[PDB]
From a paper:
The structure of [name] in complex with the substrate analogue [name] (Ki of 1.1 nM) was determined to 2.08 Å resolution. In both complexes, the two subunits of the [name] homodimer adopt the active conformation, showing that Cys195 is exposed to the catalytic cavity, as occurs in previously reported structures. [name] fully occupies the [name] active site, perfectly mimicking the interactions entailed by [name] in the substrate pocket. The 5-fluorine of [name] forms an additional water-mediated interaction with the Tyr135 hydroxyl. [name] C6 is positioned 3.09–3.29 Å away from the Cys195 thiol, which is the same distance observed in the [name] complex. On the other hand, in our complex, [name] mimics the substrate, placing its 5-fluoro-uracil C6 in an optimal position to form the covalent adduct with the reactive thiol of Cys195. In contrast, in the [name] complex, the [name] uracil is shifted far from the isostructural Tyr135, and a water molecule mediates its interaction with the fluorine of the inhibitor. A comparison of EfTS and [name] complexes shows that, in [name], the orientation of His196 prevents the inhibitor from lying closer to Tyr135, whereas in EfTS, the sidechain of His198 (corresponding to [name] His196) is rotated by ~70°, allowing the direct interaction between the fluorine and Tyr145. The superimposition further evidences that [name] in [name] partially overlaps the cofactor site of EfTS.
Residue numbers in the entry:
A (entry chain B): 26 to 310
B (entry chain A): 26 to 312
The structure:
């Protein structure tokens, strides 16, 4: 069977071959395709891309932060992961017109939507217990009680809350599916920077599937990634061509180190990537 | 150049060969694949399937009803289209524990979520003006002013509102995309009855894209159909095998008959399907 990575690499090649030039919200330029889909086996392997190092600690730490329901960049920052720090800075907030906001306050982005969808956002320090729909606990409950259900969805796209967020979500929704004791997940990603974002994003949702599989006693099945605007920044086309020469090495395995009963009880040291041997690290703006 | 109907037919074959048996809430049994995606050109052709007659009057009438923001099965019924009638009936409403509610009252389904997302649903007769987000007008505005936008989304999946709905939306969200003066659309469909629902669902969203292209002065591009649980009900197998042996005839064209200024302005008789001559209707039992 071909390496799972060839799916991502063949997406890159497709956008180079067939993507069209499209300007962007910043002004750097992209090659773009609309509508793509790839399937990554989660069976006895973990699709952490090998042809360039993926920031695994960021993936895991960010996901734990979502699961907590945090909308405070500082709480992620204190764990050594700075990827949301800019969006919560004083200048950034002011330039969205959020001048009365405390620094760190991303507004109602993924952690809030996942744990408290539909509640009124107040600030990042407010008490939201028992408010809004806990979609993440809902998905886990349905998987255990009704695995056949075709409505196992967690949605982060909330039109009312869109103007309040520091950044509109890229991961608009995901869906879970159970057959034959195997849990699968499909992510609808509205916009994917193929060089810098997508490898990270594939890791997050594969990891979210391993976690829910572990707690519901199921085996990980497939991760299906669906893209809206799939794009390569003009200034990555060269770096990417470097990457396309590299032979994928076999994906690592993901080990969960103890038996965990509730999604909230997971911690970073619960997880060990085994046998990750990626190619030479490649920097990208 | 291969016929676009082969995309749909290919999917049927894929599920028959590789789908796994999976029970559903309806007790019927299905063969199921999770995650599929097909692409339909809208360039000078409209993908209304030809290997069986599709209910076009239904497609068009149901979309105009969504657009008007109606949640009243009776308003669609009066136009001759009965597909939401069962869901807005005494017996059914009762069985969802909505003893209180009036016949026709589907709750906050597509029409409400498209024009009033996040507003407080009362009943099917309330005036919702200026409440919730008008995601449909918002898509149109963004297309006119900033066609490069990677956020042109319309979502009908509203966790908060699911308890009040006659049933949860199959069409969870769509996304629009513009390049080279061409408007494309991607539907995320969480659950697809490949026999009975999908051919209709393809024509609904192809039609919505033609409409929005018309008012924004763009040309229709591609319709990308993404599926979650793509399934065939076991009692559809025999009729789909008959369908698989028919030869696709050329897709029709869709014509819009006047220049139209606002999406709320379109009426049924503004549209003409031209050259639609399908293979006969194929009855398939509802689950
Ligand atoms: O998790 C993410 N992954 C990702 O690839 N992007 C990329 C997509 C796009 O290149 C940009 C966000 O911009 P826009 O809102 O215009 O699509 O970031 C953003 C994320 F949050
Ligand atoms: O537009 C639709 N298309 C469709 O294919 N279904 C099918 C999918 C599934 O067979 C059933 C809805 O069931 P559930 O909610 O269990 O997925 O109806 C329903 C619609 F409204």
């Amino acid at each position: 069977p071909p390496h799972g990575e060839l799916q991502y690499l063949g997406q890159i090649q497709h956008i180079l071959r067939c993507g069209v030039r499209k300007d962007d919200r910043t002004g750097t330029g992209t090659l773009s395709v609309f509508g793509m889909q790839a399937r990554y086996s989660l069976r006895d392997e973990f699709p952490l891309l090998t042809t360039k190092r993926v920031f695994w600690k960021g993936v895991l730490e960010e996901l734990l932060w979502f699961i907590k329901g945090s909308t405070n960049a500082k709480e992620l920052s204190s764990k050594g992961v700075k990827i949301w720090d800019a969006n919560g800075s004083r200048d950034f907030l002011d330039s969205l017109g959020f001048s009365t906001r405390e620094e760190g306050d991303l507004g109602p982005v993924y952690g809030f939507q996942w744990r408290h969808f539909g509640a009124e956002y107040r600030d990042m320090e407010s008490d939201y217990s028992g408010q809004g729909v806990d979609q993440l606990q809902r998905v886990i409950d349905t998987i255990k009680t009704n695995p056949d259900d075709r409505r196992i969805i967690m949605c982060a796209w909330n039109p009312r809350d869109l103007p309040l967020m520091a950044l509109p979500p890229c991961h608009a929704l995901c869906q879970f599916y159970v057959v034959n004791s195997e849990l699968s997940c499909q992510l609808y990603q509205r916009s994917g920077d193929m060089g810098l974002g997508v490898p990270f994003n594939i890791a997050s949702y594969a990891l979210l599937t391993y976690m829910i599989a572990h707690i519901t006693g199921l085996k990980p099945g497939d991760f299906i990634h669906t893209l809206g605007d799939a794009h390569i920044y003009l200034n990555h086309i060269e770096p990417l061509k470097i990457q396309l020469q590299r032979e994928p090495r076999p994906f690592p395995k993901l080990r969960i180190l103890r038996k965990v009963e509730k999604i909230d009880d997971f911690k970073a040291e619960d997880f060990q990537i085994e046998g990750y041997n990626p190619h030479p690290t490649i920097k990208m703006e």
